[PDB]
């Protein structure tokens, strides 16, 4: 692992404070490049944050706020790009970390030498020292040097001086390795970055943050793209043109853009583009296409793009908080939803101004054809009359290309449900699953969550559900027939896999091949009904397939090859029964 997405909770409180820190651990453990915002908030004093050791680059902003922890270890963070900015102004925001006393004492951002866009906002940090000391202007990129800088220096403690090692008295802390290294105001000539005051110390044009040498392979960071160790302005195109005829030919060295990287293939759960990019949404004249292997590409609609079902946070539903009776009809007939679904308490309170009744449990059956959600599924309210989430029985994938609060692809909280019932769900493409405070919910332990996940940054965070010891104690375990003890709820229609046979969607021990009515045949472990014109057999099988010509023997008459109830009575046909049961044509024309 080197790349991980960020979050998008800003200053909102975690709904499950008991599982917030393991959420951050699962996200950032081993991560080196945060492709989003690094948000560290509401962390207690004794919080172990070692899993942040390896972060070198943040593509969005860094938000460090409302913490009691005395130190966040980001000594290796080299560059903040600021493609997004907190409050639309700041690549780095350190706020309200305080109130031995708690609160951040030192920033210790000893490798932070580049902010491409955005400013610095440091406010209300009573225990913080040395922030007034950094030459922030050396850190900003030349194209970002009127970036705002709002730095509160009010403290509740005295600071030791910087180490005598720091000769500019510029430091991130009191240690000798906390001195600020200047990479831009020091440089000879007009170089953007250097390793020293001579012009041989200057860094290649394609470097950001600094360099260990003058080549475009000695950068500490790439200003545009990391092409297998070489910092470059763009990736090699996927097609090159014959210099004489300008016919397209596929470039063997071509790459896709992916963040600030050039890569051979788009990573799992991303879309490839004809333009040569890896995205999470298609271009506008485009549609998604899935290949043999599971790969999904964004290929241009050869004609007008056919209609698609959009979810919340998408197109006309972009600003819509929740599914309500006002918009439930929008999902009628949908197999695949481009966007997300959120069920909030307000989902089940109607709008009496327009005499619109609240969302009724029967309307939710609109989702019973739903097989894929490209975004997330968030459920924080559900009708108490509904035992489970079975109107989502047919949901196969939650891709999680959009995550709630930037982290969770599946959230269930505060519900009355007694089991899940997502019997078809077999992949959470990305993101975490958070299941908490569902007092009556059993059958959480019974789900094989590891087979749903696709990357190791994923896990199930769960708390304050029904204790499994009561579930076991009341006999709410998987059905005997559920293979490996994996199931989504009670009974024989909730197994993930079936140890014997399947009739419809119920697991059964045997099919009615020899005993029972209607007699059946088996195909791929499925019980399927013989044609009703097959005569049932005592001591043998009754049919070899579904059709009337696959009977062992006919129950009434035979119109060869078919077992028929009666002889029928383009050529107009008139037939009568032979004494052996066969249908012959009539000879009268």
């Amino acid at each position, epitope marked *: 692992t080197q790349v991980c997405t960020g979050t998008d909770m800003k200053l909102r409180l975690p709904a499950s404070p008991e599982t917030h820190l393991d959420m951050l651990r699962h996200l950032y453990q081993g991560c080196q490049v945060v492709q989003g915002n690094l948000e560290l908030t509401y962390l207690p004093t004794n919080a172990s944050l070692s899993f942040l050791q390896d972060i070198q680059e943040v593509q969005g902003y860094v938000l460090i706020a409302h913490n009691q922890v005395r130190q966040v270890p980001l000594q290796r963070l080299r560059i903040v790009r600021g493609t997004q900015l907190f409050e639309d102004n700041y690549a780095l925001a350190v706020l309200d970390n305080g109130d031995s006393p708690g609160g951040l004492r030192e920033l210790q951002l000893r490798s932070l030498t580049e902010i491409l866009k955005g400013g610095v906002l440091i406010q209300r940090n009573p225990q913080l020292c040395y922030q007034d000391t950094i030459l922030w202007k050396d850190i900003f990129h030349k194209n970002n040097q009127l970036a705002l800088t709002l730095i509160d220096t009010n403290r509740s403690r005295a600071c030791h001086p910087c180490s005598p090692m720091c000769k500019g008295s510029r430091c991130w802390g009191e240690s000798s390795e906390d001195c600020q290294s200047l990479t831009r105001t020091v440089c000879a000539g007009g170089c953007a970055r250097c390793k020293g005051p001579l012009p041989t110390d200057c860094c290649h044009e394609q470097c950001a943050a600094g360099c260990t040498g003058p080549k475009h392979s000695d950068c500490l960071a790439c200003l545009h793209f990391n092409h297998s160790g070489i910092c470059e302005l763009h990736c090699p195109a996927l097609v090159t043109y014959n210099t004489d005829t300008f016919e397209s030919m596929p470039n063997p060295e071509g790459r896709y853009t992916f963040g600030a990287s050039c890569v051979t293939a788009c990573p799992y759960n991303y879309l490839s583009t004809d333009v040569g990019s890896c995205t999470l949404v298609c271009p506008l004249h485009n549609q998604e296409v899935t290949a043999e292997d599971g790969t999904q590409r964004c290929e241009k609609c050869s004609k007008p793009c056919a209609r698609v079902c959009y979810g919340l946070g998408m197109e006309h539903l972009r600003e819509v908080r929740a599914v309500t009776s006002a918009n439930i009809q929008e999902f009628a007939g949908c197999k695949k939803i481009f966007g997300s679904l959120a069920f909030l308490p307000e989902s089940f309170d109607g709008d009496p101004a327009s005499n619109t009744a609240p969302l009724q449990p029967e309307q939710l059956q609109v989702f019973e054809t739903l097989e894929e959600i490209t975004g997330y599924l968030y459920i924080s309210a559900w009708p108490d009359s509904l035992p489970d989430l079975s109107v989502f029985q047919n949901l196969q994938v939650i891709r999680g290309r959009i995550l709630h609060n930037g982290a969770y692809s599946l959230t269930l909280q505060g519900l009355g449900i007694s089991w899940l019932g997502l019997r078809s769900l077999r992949e959470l493409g990305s993101g975490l699953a958070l299941i908490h405070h569902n007092t009556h919910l059993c059958f959480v332990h019974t789900v094989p969550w590891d087979q749903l996940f696709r990357n190791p940054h994923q896990a199930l965070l769960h708390t304050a559900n029904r204790p499994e010891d009561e579930c076991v104690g009341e006999g709410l375990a998987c059905h005997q027939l559920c293979a490996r003890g994996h199931c989504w709820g009670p009974g024989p229609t909730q197994c993930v896999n079936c140890s014997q046979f399947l009739r419809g969607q119920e697991c059964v021990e045997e099919c009615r091949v020899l005993q029972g009515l209607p007699r059946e045949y088996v195909n791929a472990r499925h019980c399927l009904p013989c044609h009703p014109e097959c005569q049932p057999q005592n001591g043998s099988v009754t049919c070899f397939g579904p059709e009337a010509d696959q009977c062992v023997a006919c129950a009434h008459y035979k119109d060869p090859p078919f077992c028929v109830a009666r002889c029928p009575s*383009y050529m107009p046909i008139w*037939k009568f029964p032979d004494e052996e049961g066969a249908c012959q044509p009539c000879p009268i024309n």
Partner: antibody
Amino acid sequence: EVQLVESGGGLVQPGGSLRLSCAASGFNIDDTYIHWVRQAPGKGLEWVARIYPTNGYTRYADSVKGRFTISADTSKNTAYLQMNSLRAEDTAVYYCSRWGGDGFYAMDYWGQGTLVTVSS
Amino acid sequence: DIQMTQSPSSLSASVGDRVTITCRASQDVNTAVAWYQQKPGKAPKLLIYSADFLYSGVPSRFSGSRSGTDFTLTISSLQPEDFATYYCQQHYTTPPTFGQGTKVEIKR
């Protein structure tokens, strides 16, 4: 007036795929069964596959099971033979024929055949 | 799986002569037998369905008869246009199976 027109044959490399199409006209394929019968050059008729488009039930000959798949589009009133993993022995004129009706299980109408040639 | 064995594989008869083609089933196939005519490079054409019924539009010099598992196509007055390969077929069971065919050449 009943008619069946096949298309999609031609040359294909051994191992390669091909898909023939039978455009039915003057009748609905949902009312009867549709067959593919083929004839290698200078040889006899070989029944190959059958489909009941009402419900898509299919049946195949031993010589083609696991490689050929017959299907139907009732909206386009067409049937299709998808031939994968082809061999030189499969080289033949492929005919599409129908069964006459509900109680008429002789092949009354035939298209005039598309020749599939399997060669490097 | 029921086989249809056709005999002879080829015959030569003169114009106006009575020609008998024989086709024997490996089991009881009842009357589910059809006879087709095929001229070179052409689609086969239905001549007789249900063993002994003449299909509409076909000349009456074509008859079919049945004797147990033995099925006989007869052309009572061979005409030059009757040069073709003739095939028998069973549809008593699935799969339907064709005979090997009989080539009829006119001797003049």
